[PDB]
Amino acid sequence: LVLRGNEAKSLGEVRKLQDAGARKVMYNLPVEDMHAPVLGPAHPYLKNHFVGHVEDAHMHPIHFEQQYHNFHALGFGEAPSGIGVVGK
Amino acid sequence: NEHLVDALPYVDSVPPELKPHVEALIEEEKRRSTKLPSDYLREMPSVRAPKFDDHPVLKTEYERVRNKEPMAPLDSVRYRLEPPPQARRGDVGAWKSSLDNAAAQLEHQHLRILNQELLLKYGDKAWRAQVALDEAAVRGLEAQLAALRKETDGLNRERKLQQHAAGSELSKLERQYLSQVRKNADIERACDRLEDAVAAMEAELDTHIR
Amino acid sequence: APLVQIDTSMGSFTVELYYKHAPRTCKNFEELAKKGYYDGTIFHRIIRDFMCQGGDPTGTGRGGESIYGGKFEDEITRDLKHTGAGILSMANSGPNTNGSQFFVTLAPTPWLDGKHTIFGRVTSGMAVIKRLGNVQTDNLDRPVTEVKVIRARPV
Amino acid sequence: KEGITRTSNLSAPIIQLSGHAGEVFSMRFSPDGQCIASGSFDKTIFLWRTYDENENYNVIAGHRNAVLEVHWFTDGEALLSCSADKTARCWDAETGAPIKKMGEHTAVVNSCCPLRRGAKVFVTGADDSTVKVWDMRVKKSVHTLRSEFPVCAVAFADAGDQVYSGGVDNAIKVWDLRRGGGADVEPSMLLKGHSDSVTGLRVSPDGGHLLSNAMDNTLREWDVRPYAPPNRCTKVFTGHMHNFEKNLLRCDYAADGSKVACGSADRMVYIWDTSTRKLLYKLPGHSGSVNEVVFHSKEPIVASASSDKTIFLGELTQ
Amino acid sequence: MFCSISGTVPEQGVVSTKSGHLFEKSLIEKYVRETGKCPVTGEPLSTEDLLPLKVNKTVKPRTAPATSIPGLLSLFHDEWDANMLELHNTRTQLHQTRQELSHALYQHDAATRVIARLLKERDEARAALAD
Amino acid sequence: SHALYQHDAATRVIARLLKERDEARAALADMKQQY
């Protein structure tokens, strides 16, 4: 019964991808489906604004001001990306 | 009449040197088997006698044929088309027999040449067509084969996928059974602590009498 | 191994498949052409002066299957360098992540040497590639007139 | 079109819950899985239905500051709200009336967990470094333990005799309340391995496992079984984020113990497969830090709450 | 093209309507009245349900020696020779295949008994290790 | 097609079950090695 089997199955249709442009996700897929990048040569230069990506944010107001003034006045503050601190 | 007495074969590969072991086990299984027939066709349906009790024709046909003693080819000696021999020459009714065979073979060869002329005149595209039809049956049959191969392969692939979906869960269930085993050994050292705690209690009553 | 054929809604052109410098990739393209995979299969990403990507059946551009079941590894050399137009290379999302997606280059793209496994070059129908690079594309570099690959097959 | 295996009865596989006017700090599904208790920074609790309209049929008010943490009580009709206005409050859900408001804490009552088997009793740990145990029918607090550093996350164990509290002090503690009827008990267990504060604590559906989210950007899984190895640490998860916001980012177990969901500060809803310790879902869509994620009691539905005044409510496909 | 029961192209081509199986006219009439059923499966069938698929078979090509009354009857001869020369060999192939099947069935029964036994072995082994 | 394949499958069954047997045997063997 083990006669011969292949690994061709479990690919094809099941892997549901979204169009390389669409900025919504209509269904909750796994990370490998929804994510898992487009393809191809970097290109020479799909973004949101014109010169970058503008995204809404929501914090509590202490945090904008506190970080804006740790850098603003002191010179050195927290990166708003969550990656370390900025400056000297 | 067993129901799905199966361990999955795409998961559970039979080892090399387990062929001799499983062979010897099946052999001793055989040795003291309950009703060892090796003619167990007795329970198989009765394979009946060849049903021509209403045609003696096929009756005698089979009675000879199983002995394979062939029928002789048809009347080759009459076919050589010969008139009455020495002991048959003088009698004329023998020349009536000769009329029969000579005239019969005469028109034999006549309608023979008629049929041959009729095909070599006409038959060419008929053979064209029937050889086309033999090729059609050929290719249709191999098409059936490719189809059956395809559907069966798809079913086999589905079976393999199902086997994979199960063997993983089985393996993990068994490894967590082994972890349940080590957990039992943990609670064994718990029983150790039971003994130790009672030995410790074997001091409070001492002080109590003291 | 020689001479696979693409015939597209813009035209037909034929690429050789380099045997020695990249056997895995070439065998992939050979067999995927054979199996009817690159049919339909619109050129989804066309950038002038850069490349003509194709090979994703889903039209998304996110993933195209292989014959090995998924990704496979590059075959970058110090020999195979993207030097001019018509070079056929595989599209990867980084190192050793090729799928099926390929791109014909329309220009010399040095900045891809070392990242994208070449496996061939367009032997016949460079006119089709020139006409196909200049097609109208949207802000995503997607041809506004679908450029289908109506049939791909070896010859 | 696209026909991908509708799991739940929800009209759509991704539903956003709006109507709040502040950050949403903690949420909770009814035990019978057809209610939502959402507690916002706007010191208000929205009650949503999980099916057929997602109707916020009641807004309960009565806290004077952000309602930081909400659970439901074991039968689902009484609600435990905990706030920054130093006041924890028991409400009746069907009605819209508050039942018992205890405000014994001196500072913001960050964390609370009501006991799931036994009496109507809930733990609350606040900024005063004191973790207090609260029985429903007495008006005094039944227990009060004093750490030295402000309590961020607290949970009551499955079985009902110990309390887990984790905070800014780099170590989460397990305390025994029956072992302590005194006012300066010392901690029973010291789970160490987080490199800074703990923010969220969830008791596993079997009770042997405790989930801790840390601003060590690390989810850690410890075992609470009294017979453990020397290191009770079992699992580590990477992937989520904690930032300068230092919001109360929580934990959750899927109702089956199969997934673990964390709220993150990178606005992403993270859902790991506990076994392989790897990332199953990384759902986008939130504009603010994701505060708490709750797995629906019956179905694989995940609902998240963010600091963006909305709550996404959807099902998982794979 | 062939009647399933016949195996060579029917000269009175007939499918039954109920079945999907094309049949020899005389033969399948005899068979429908000979058991009352569809000989492809055993399905119940009646003789009129037969459908006269007739598109004029007349293609059977005279071969070279067969083109002769002496030839046609001589090949008639070796033909009937071969028809019974196949049927009897199928009788004995049935017998040996049937015998093989019986042996296989007995082997299978032995295997089932061993699996039943070895399972008791393993189940008690594990229940013991549980102590 | 039933029988021969089924006996192959039964060889597989008892192979699985004897591996299971010797696995539990090694389990008890480590068990009593401990004590």
3-state secondary structure chain A: CCCCCCCCCCCCCCCCCCCCCCCCCCCCCCHHHHCCCCCCCCCCCCCCCCCCCCCCCECCHHHHHHHHHHHHCCCCEECCCCCCEECC
For residue C28, the tally of other CB atoms under 10 A from its CB is: 23
DSSP state of B40: G
Q: Is the dihedral of CA C81, C84, C89, C94 positive or negative?
A: positive
Q: Do C49 and A44 touch (CB under 8 A)?
A: yes
CB within 8 Å: B9 and A1 = yes
Q: To probe the interface with E, which of F1, F11, F17 has the most E CB atoms within 10 Å?
A: F17
CA atoms of C73 and C90, how far apart (whole Å) = 11
Question: Are the Cβ atoms of A56 and D287 closer than 8 angstroms?
Answer: yes
Contacts of D75 (CB under 8 A, 6+ apart): D31
Burial of residue B114 (number of CB atoms within 10 Å: 0-12, 13-18, 19+)? exposed
Using DSSP's 3-state secondary structure scheme, residue D210 falls into strand
With an 8 Å Cβ cutoff, is B181 touching chain F?
yes
Three-class SS of residue C121?
A: strand
The 3-class secondary structure across C30-52, one letter per residue, is HHHHHCCCCCECCCCEEECCCEE
Q: Does residue A81 sit at the B interface (CB-CB below 8 Å)? A: no
> How far is C1 from C16, CA to CA, in rounded Å?
7
Could you give the 3-state DSSP secondary structure of residue D64? coil
Quick check: D212 and D181 in contact, CB under 8 A?
Answer: no
Active-site annotation holds for C53:
yes
State CA D218 to chain mean position distance: 17
Looking up tokens 């005194």 gives D182
Residues 6+ apart with CB under 8 A from A85: A76, A77, A78, A79
Residue E49 in contact with residue E30, Cβ under 8 Å?
Answer: no
CA dist A41 and A43 (Å) reads 5
Active site residue C21: no
CA B63 – CA E84 distance, rounded (Å): 11
Subunits next to B (3 or more Cβ pairs <8 Å) are A, D, E, F
Closest C-alpha to D124, from D162, D85, D151, D159 = D151
Q: Which stretch of DSSP H or E encloses residue D140?
A: none
Integer Cα distance of E15 and E116 in angstroms: 50
Torsion angle (degrees, nearest 10) of CA C8, C13, C18, C24: 10
Provide CB contacts within 8 A for C82, sequence distance 6+: C89, C105, C108, C109, C110, C112, C113, C116, C118
| Method used to determine the 3D structure | cryo-EM
Task: Please say whether the beta carbons of D230 and D221 come within 8 A.
Answer: no
Structure tokens at A48: 């949101």
Task: Please identify which of the residues C112, C119, C121, C132 carries the catalytic annotation.
Answer: C112
- Chain breaks in chain F following residues, C–N > 2.5 Å: none
CA distance D54 to D10: 9
> Is the Cβ–Cβ distance between E104 and F4 less than 8 Å?
yes
Both tokens assigned to B90: 């003088």
Identify the DSSP state of D137.
Answer: S
Is B9 in Cβ contact with F12 (below 8 Å)?
Answer: yes
Calculate how close chain D gets to A83, using CA atoms only, in Å.
Answer: 9
Is C112 noted as a catalytic residue in this protein?
yes
Distance from CA of F3 to the nearest CA of B (A): 11
Task: Calculate the alpha carbon distances from C110 to B141, C92, C115, C118, D192 in Å.
Answer: 55, 16, 10, 12, 52
Q: Is C103 a catalytic residue?
A: yes
Evaluate whether C117 touches C22 at the Cβ level (below 8 Å): yes
Helices (H) and strands (E) in chain C, counts: 2, 8
The minimal CB distance from C140 to the residues A15, A44, A46 is found for A46
Q: Are B33 and E113 in contact (CB under 8 A)?
A: yes
Active-site residue, from C44, C82, C116, C121: C116
The answer to whether residues D167 and D147 touch, using CB atoms and an 8 Å cutoff, is yes
C15, C131 contact by CB (below 8 A)? no
- Which residues of chain D make contact with A59, given a CB cutoff of 8 A? 245, 288-289, 307
State whether residue B95 sits within 8 Å of chain A by CB.
Answer: no
Pairs from A47-53 (Cβ < 8 Å, separation ≥ 24):
A48/A23
Q: D13 contacts in A (CB within 8 Å)?
A: 26-28
CA–CA gap between residue A29 and residue A36 (Å, rounded): 12
* Residue E79 DSSP code: H
Q: What angle do CA F7, F12, F16 make, to 5 degrees?
A: 145
DSSP D5-39: ---SSSSSSEEEEE--SS-EEEEEE-TTSSEEEEE
What distance in Å separates the CA atoms of residue D141 and residue D152, rounded to the nearest whole number?
19
Q: How far is CA D217 from CA B189, C23, D152, D154, in A?
A: 37, 44, 15, 19
Residues 6+ apart with CB under 8 A from F27: B178, B181, E129
Q: How far is C142 from chain A (nearest CA, A)?
A: 10
Q: Burial of B54 by CB count in 10 Å (0-12 exposed, 13-18 middle, 19+ buried)? A: exposed
Q: Which residues of A touch C92 (CB under 8 A)?
A: 39
Q: How many CB atoms lie within 10 A of CB C134?
A: 12
Q: Do F10 and B5 touch (CB under 8 A)?
A: yes
Return the number of other C-beta atoms located less than 10 Å from residue D105's C-beta.
23
* Token pair recorded at residue C100: 């099926």
In A, minimum Cα distance to F9 occurs at: A1
The answer to whether the CB of B160 falls within 8 A of the CB of E95 is no
Give Cβ neighbours of residue B138 (< 8 Å, ≥ 6 apart). Answer: none
Neighbours of D217 (CB within 10 A): 19
Contact D57, D82 (CB under 8 A): no
Q: Is C123 buried (19+), middle (13-18) or exposed (0-12) by CB count in 10 A?
A: middle
Alpha helix locations (H) across C67-137? 126-133
Contact (Cβ atoms closer than 8 angstroms) between residue D198 and residue D217: no
Sheet with D302-306, strands from edge to edge, namely: D14-18, D310-314, D302-306, D290-295
Tell me the C-alpha distance between C64 and C56, whole Å. 5
Which residues from chain B sit within 8 angstroms of residue D227, using beta carbons? 186-187, 190
C102 catalytically annotated: no
Choose among C56, C148, C57: nearest CA to C93.
C56
Report yes or no: C79 and C118 within 8 Å, Cβ to Cβ: no
User: How many other CB atoms are there within 10 angstroms of residue B151's CB atom?
Assistant: 10
Active-site entry in C17, C32, C80, C92? C92
Count the Cβ atoms, other than its own, within 10 Å of residue D121.
Answer: 19
Residue B8 main-chain phi, psi, to 5 deg: -60, 130
Those chains having 3 or more beta-carbon pairs within 8 angstroms of chain E are B, F
- According to DSSP, residue C143 is labeled B
By CB atoms closer than 10 A (0-12, 13-18, 19+), residue C143 is buried
Largest CA distance in chain D: 65
**D318 CB within 8 Å of a chain B CB:** no
How far, in Å, CA of E48 to CA of E10, rounded?
18
Write down the residue that tokens 């309608």 correspond to: B111
DSSP letter string over D271-291? EEETTTTEEEEEE---SB-EE
> What distance in Å separates the CA atoms of residue B151 and residue E68, rounded to the nearest whole number?
48
**Structural contact between residues D89 and D62, judged by C-beta atoms closer than 8 angstroms:** yes
Q: Please give the angle made by the CA atoms of E100, E105 and E109, to the nearest 5 degrees.
A: 150
Residues of E in contact with F3 (CB under 8 A): 101, 104-105, 107-108
Cα-based torsion angle of the residue sequence B120, B123, B124, B126 in order, rounded to the nearest 10 degrees:
-170
Q: Which contacts of D126-135 are long-range, i.e. CB under 8 A and separated by 24 or more positions?
A: D126/D86, D126/D150, D126/D151, D127/D151, D129/D167, D130/D105, D131/D163, D131/D165, D131/D175, D132/D104, D132/D105, D133/D163, D133/D177, D134/D88, D134/D102
Phi, psi dihedral angles at C53 (to 5 degrees): -75, 145
